[PDB]
Design a binder for these strands. Structure first.
Ligand SMILES: NCCCCCCN
Ligand code: NA
Length: 153
RNA sequence: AGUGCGACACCUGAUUCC
DNA sequence: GGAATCAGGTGTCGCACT
């Protein structure tokens, strides 16, 4: 039936050895089977699961704009990313980016970059279970892992 | 802030099986 | 590589008491 106005995308950020001596992080964006915009890229910068998860969503939005898409359904496993961008950020901006314990919000730069990207976009953030066997979740994850094998720069 | 709790991720190691 | 299982870790946030 119907057919809406949204285009669906699955993102994933992975980080092998997260919290260990040599973490390797990547981002993956999946637009559909064999879709030309699918990507698996090495994450530039500080290597962590949280940053990768947030930056995978940035990448999706960025690509979305590249195509004049402005009604996007973005699935991610990261409630940290969802809650951050759809809730915590409003408050952080009104309190000097401060944690529940008054400490500096660690991923400020990441959430700032993400919010800037959301401008002009009607994004519906949805959650997909990390262990979802759905093709979208697996491919995004597989893509992230492939990206993390790349070197930086 | 300290402590505790909650939550979603990301891992590392073993074992079974394909 | 993959279907699971068990141990243990960090990434990071909110919350409530002290
Ligand atoms: N439900 C308790 C989860 C604790 C996660 C600790 C991560 N450093
Ligand atoms: Na994920």
């Amino acid at each position: 039936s119907h057919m809406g106005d949204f285009v669906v995308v699955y993102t994933d950020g992975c980080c092998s050895s997260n919290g260990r001596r040599r973490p390797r992080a990547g981002i993956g964006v999946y637009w559909g089977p064999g879709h030309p915009l699918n990507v698996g890229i090495r994450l530039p910068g500080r290597q962590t699961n949280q940053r990768a998860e947030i930056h995978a969503a940035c990448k999706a939005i960025e690509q979305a704009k590249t195509q004049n898409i402005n009604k996007l359904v973005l699935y991610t496993n990261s409630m940290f990313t969802i809650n951050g961008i759809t809730n915590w950020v409003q408050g952080w901006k009104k309190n000097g980016w401060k944690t529940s314990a008054g400490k500096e919000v660690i991923n400020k730069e990441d959430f700032v970059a993400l919010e800037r990207l959301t401008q002009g976009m009607d994004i519906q953030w949805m959650h997909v279970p990390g262990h979802s066997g759905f093709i979208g979740n697996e491919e995004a994850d597989r893509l992230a892992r492939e990206g993390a094998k790349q070197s930086e720069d």
